[PDB]
Amino acid sequence: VISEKVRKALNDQLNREIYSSYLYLSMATYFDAEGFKGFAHWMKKQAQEELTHAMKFYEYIYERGGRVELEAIEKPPSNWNGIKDAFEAALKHEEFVTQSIYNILELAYEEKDHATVSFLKWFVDEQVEEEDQVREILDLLEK
């Protein structure tokens, strides 16, 4: 019973979560090249976490009677100017993902799609946590 509009929006987001996963893997390639096994391992966990986010969107879309369409994934950046600069790029990206979700939340509220509104709440909470995990990294590394 999902509108085509809310379905398109959730499919767009599914593809956004796939690119999120690819960017984070890209960041690991930078960390691994620079010898930072530990930051690379962190980025690889994150890349796997975003994939399960994308599959939660995948399965919810089919539960509501929609179809998934996978789009082209753009080439991510492969180099930053140091650790801090990578993680600040991570944080900026997370915040873009959070705004992306909030616009779906708004459209769901508009259409009174109470099931979608409830589905997204988990992703709102998890992005709050992830944004703050990156802030704690940046603070721990300060100066």
Rounded to whole angstroms, how far apart are CA atoms 70 and 68? 7
What is the distance between the alpha carbons of residues 15 and 73, in angstroms, rounded to a whole number?
8
**Distance between CA atoms of residues 135 and 84, nearest Å:** 10
| Residue reference for tokens 């796997």 | 48
Q: Which does 25 bind (CB under 5 to 8 A by kind): a second copy, Fe ion, none?
A: a second copy
Q: Is 33 in the site for a second copy (CB under 8 A)?
A: yes
Q: Which of 32, 88, 111, 131 binds a second copy (CB under 8 A)?
A: 32
Asked if 61 and 1 count as a contact pair (C-beta separation under 8 A), the reply is no
Give the closest residue to 61 by CA, choosing from 108, 21, 18, 6. Answer: 6
Task: Give the nearest distance from C-beta 26 to a second copy in angstroms.
Answer: 5
For residue 53, state whether it binds Fe ion (rule: CB under 5 A).
yes
Q: How far apart are CA 109 and CA 74, in angstroms?
A: 31
110 is an annotated ligand-binding site residue = no
Piece in contact with Fe ion (CB under 5 A), picked from 31-39, 44-52, 60-68, 102-110: 44-52
Name which of residues 79 to 138 contact a second copy (CB under 8 A): none
Toward Fe ion, which CB reaches closer, 79 or 90?
Answer: 90
By CB under 8 A, name the binding residues for a second copy: 22, 25-26, 29, 32-33, 58, 62, 67-76, 78
